[PDB]
Symmetry: C3
Subunit: 289 residues, 3 copies
Amino acid sequence: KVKVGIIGGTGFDDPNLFKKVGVRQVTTPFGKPSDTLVEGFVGDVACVVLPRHGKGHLIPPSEVNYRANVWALKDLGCTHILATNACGSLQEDLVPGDFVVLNQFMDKTWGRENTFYGSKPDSLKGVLHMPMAEPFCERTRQILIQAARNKSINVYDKKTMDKSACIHPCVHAEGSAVTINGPRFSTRCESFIHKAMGLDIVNMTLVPEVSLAREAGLSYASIAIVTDFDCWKSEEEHVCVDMVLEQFRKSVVHVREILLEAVALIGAEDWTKTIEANKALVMSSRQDL
Amino acid sequence: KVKVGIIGGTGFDDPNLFKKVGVRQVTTPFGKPSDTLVEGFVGDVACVVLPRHGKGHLIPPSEVNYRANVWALKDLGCTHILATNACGSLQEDLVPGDFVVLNQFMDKTWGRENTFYGSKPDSLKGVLHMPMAEPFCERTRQILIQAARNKSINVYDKKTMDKSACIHPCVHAEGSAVTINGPRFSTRCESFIHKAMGLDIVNMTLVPEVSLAREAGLSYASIAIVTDFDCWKCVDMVLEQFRKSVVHVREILLEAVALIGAEDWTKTIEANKALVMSSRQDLL
Amino acid sequence: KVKVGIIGGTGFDDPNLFKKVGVRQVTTPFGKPSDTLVEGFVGDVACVVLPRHGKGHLIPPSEVNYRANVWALKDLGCTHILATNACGSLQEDLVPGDFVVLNQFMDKTWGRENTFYGSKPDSLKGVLHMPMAEPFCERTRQILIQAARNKSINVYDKKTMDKSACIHPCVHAEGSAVTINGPRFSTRCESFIHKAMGLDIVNMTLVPEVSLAREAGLSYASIAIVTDFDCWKVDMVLEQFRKSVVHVREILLEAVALIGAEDWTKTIEANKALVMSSRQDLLHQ
Ligand SMILES: Nc1ncnc2[nH]cnc12
Ligand SMILES: Nc1ncnc2[nH]cnc12
Ligand SMILES: Nc1ncnc2[nH]cnc12
């Protein structure tokens, strides 16, 4: 059957999503995960929760062992990963309190281990060139959107709905993220350049987590929590740590509701062909073979 | 009391701007700084000078230990840092021989240690998320512009003056820089792309120096020397002009130190320190 | 005094361009190269070939030791380097099966050793700031283009010819590449941003290879093989890539012959003089 890993960002250190069955420590060919993993059940759906930044939020986005976290969830038999990401908005219609079910990204990270395969010692032998045109699992994306509908959260889809139909607080049914390396926030100059490229939000944690998930043969979807307008607007709306966590409290209640419904909706369907296609995509991407 | 640190770039490998009182061979948690630090006074204002690339200019931009350079100045009690940066112009009105008091940047560096904090080698415990919307100390920026005026150098502010005020050589009162990693210069393709993004100049050394200065609680301002047009558009004349630009910048730096020491900075220093404290993600 | 090195990418992990005269297992001051280097002759012209990814194609683009590859070729006496690079098209008129003799690039790589000089122990002493406005050797570019003409391969020059004179498959007489770090391909978002910038193709291996070749005082030119459209827009592509490899081999063999047919004394002089004039450490400025 299925088993859903949850990767919690800011505000989701120990989200108490179910009734904790146990705590498990996993070892990985790529090092230790950010923390031990909490195993349990949402309904009768197996679920495991892993905080991205560890215990007391001591691991910055740039130094998170994304390889170990994803592989640990794969090792425990996860078929899916749902992840949360706090983010700043680059557009007027994405406002604090909204959420975004991302479908695209632009990568500006560096110095992070972004692949399981290579020639280095602590890498799997081989060369893996994975396609990433649409880098998320689309079925799992639509689960997150449907979970929002089931919880009476407004859903805004810019592909068919105009900006006059956008009703806050809402889940944006698509969106593109630029992932910066951190730990600093962007300059106004960088923020305007990203905006001019058409990007919707900026975060620090999406990449390479999303890429490694696909490399691992797992279905991955992310829901971003809009906490601020980055720094392209007026000075009082400029992002800081205080502003990011201030918006978060009312949002985490709704995000947790979305995540819990999504896990149940995943367990209500058959994923046999999707899981097989995920694994076959990894094999067809090996260019050493 | 104020104490002004100066980080000298290309053309300032061993400036000797004042009668030196002493020299400090220091070390920091993040390693050795680029060279010995030279101590003296401009009037009654204490001043410390270090060459970004070392006395021999043997250290390329991506291998400069920016963390050690900023922290060594912090350890000596510096309240300000003034820095020079040689650059290429991406825009028609910024010509070789001009200067730019930068107020913005777009970062394309990689592989450099750009934060004092983390879970990394030598890094301090914690997670620091500094706001960087306007990344310089604005008071110190205006002191640089004011020093240029008192040195009879034309000041051009495109936001507030007409085109006819752009008389060369001039100090541009604002501007944005793309910081590339080096050591190679840009291709024509890259230069065209950076120009289309609206950037004013290209350089190799501003980042992470400016970021670490804010992390250290110090007021930072940069004055860039336009040394040529980047390749979106004879070397004996360019070299002679750069020598004149170095003379102009030495005089701006010396005047700037005196202007800084004429004002009180208690509030700004405390505000710099408080911004660091409120940026600790692990503590909130 | 002329000797042509060849760096083969995808489709050239086991090149077999000429009869192997000698097989060199070399080391460099910057590590070992991707594989043994094979020496031989194309006609009377000495030649050296090296698979960028190794025979097993086990080395991904970001882990290739570009320093060692370029330096090993130079240590063996090479004056030129011809390189192949598989790529995706970002433009309508560059169709799979076409080739591109590149003249420009935009670099989005990171974490790769991109210079021979510096202050670390595994680098040469000094600070080298190389100009790169037109980063390839123009004479060698034109030899690749002329080689395509001599082998009856269409050449499309957008500066000279009409857009309807673009007959496929063809060698494009110019073009710009974005080099991404890999190993993953681009997202649709990134592909559209790159296309919006005006870039022609996307690849993973051009940089820092082209930059190190100029640092080494060598004439470098690249021929890119369009294998697909990038995602702005399995067997039929494999058969199309098989045909592309055959015609790229023909271009490479002909280009070596054309290089050996001319005098390069002044060009080589200028290559070496550019390295020396680009030193900015003060005791060797
Ligand atoms: N403005 C911002 N930039 C990057 N990451 C963020 N996380 C929350 N707000 C952010
Ligand atoms: N064109 C240029 N690009 C980058 N750094 C420079 N320093 C001086 N000129 C430069
Ligand atoms: N689309 C693509 N992107 C990067 N490298 C490639 N090599 C072949 N096709 C490619």
